[PDB]
Amino acid sequence: HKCDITLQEIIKTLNSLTEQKTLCTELTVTDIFAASKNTTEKETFCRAATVLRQFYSHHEKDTRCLGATAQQFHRHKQLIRDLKRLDRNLWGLAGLNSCPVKEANQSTLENFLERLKTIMREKYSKCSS
């Protein structure tokens, strides 16, 4: 369960997300990693899934993000698709929706995704020989 291939699905998606630059990866999300984190693994997954759902919900049709060129629009649609895929996997791992996020600090989506990737790679490392 805790070392399920979902971890690989999450890292794969994060790898695509962080290789991605778009108009809006500099817009912010609540920094769940600014905590003196006193949180189970499941609550951290819930936390990350919550802020990302807020992000894609709010920015899927945002004029700063949608793009002028074909390439920009394609990259925006890919970003939203990947955030939904990441989120779907995170909720699967969380096993809950009740996890208030209290942090004041905001980070760019870019920085938040990089930190999440580091955390996920560490979990994978701890699962593997």
Numbering used by the authors: 1 to 129
The authors write:
Interleukin 4 (IL-4) is a pleiotropic cytokine that plays a major regulatory role in the immune system. Signal transduction of IL-4 is mediated by a sequential binding process, initiated first by binding of IL-4 to its high-affinity single membrane spanning receptor chain IL-4Rα. This intermediate ligand receptor complex then recruits one of two possible low-affinity receptor subunits, the common gamma chain (γc) or the IL-13Rα1 chain, into the functional hetero-trimeric complex to initiate signalling. The overall structure of IL-4 comprises the known four-helical bundle in up-up-down-down topology, which like the crystal packing is unaffected by these mutations.
Analysis of the variants T13D and F82D yielded dissociation constants KD of 0.02 – 0.04 nM and 0.03 – 0.04 nM respectively. The structures of the IL-4 variants T13D (max. resolution 1.65 Å), F82D (max. resolution 1.7Å) and T13D-F82D (max. resolution 1.8Å) were refined on the basis of the structure of wild-type IL-4 (max. resolution 1.8Å); all crystals were obtained under identical conditions, allowing detailed comparison. The structure of the super-agonist variant F82D shows a different picture; the side chain conformation, i.e. the χ1 and χ2 torsion angles, of Asp82 is identical to that of the wild-type Phe82. Interestingly, the high-resolution structure of variant F82D reveals two alternative side chain conformations for Arg85. In one, the side chain is not hydrogen-bonded to the Asp residue introduced at position 82 and is oriented towards the solvent. In the second, the side chain interacts with the carboxylate group of Asp82 via a weak single hydrogen bond, but it is much less fixed than in the variant T13D. The distance between the amino group of Arg85 and the carboxylate group of Asp82 is 3.2Å and therefore close to the exclusion criterion for a hydrogen bond. In addition, the temperature factors of the Arg85 side chain atoms are elevated compared to those of rigid main chain or side chain atoms in the variant F82D, indicating that the stabilization of a certain side chain conformation is not as rigid as in variant T13D. The model of the F82D:IL-4Rα complex allows us to propose a stabilizing mechanism similar to that suggested for the complex of T13D and IL-4Rα. Here, too, the carboxylate group of Asp82 (F82D) forms a bi-dentate salt bridge with the guanidinium group of Arg85, thereby immobilizing the side chain of Arg85 in the ligand-receptor interface.
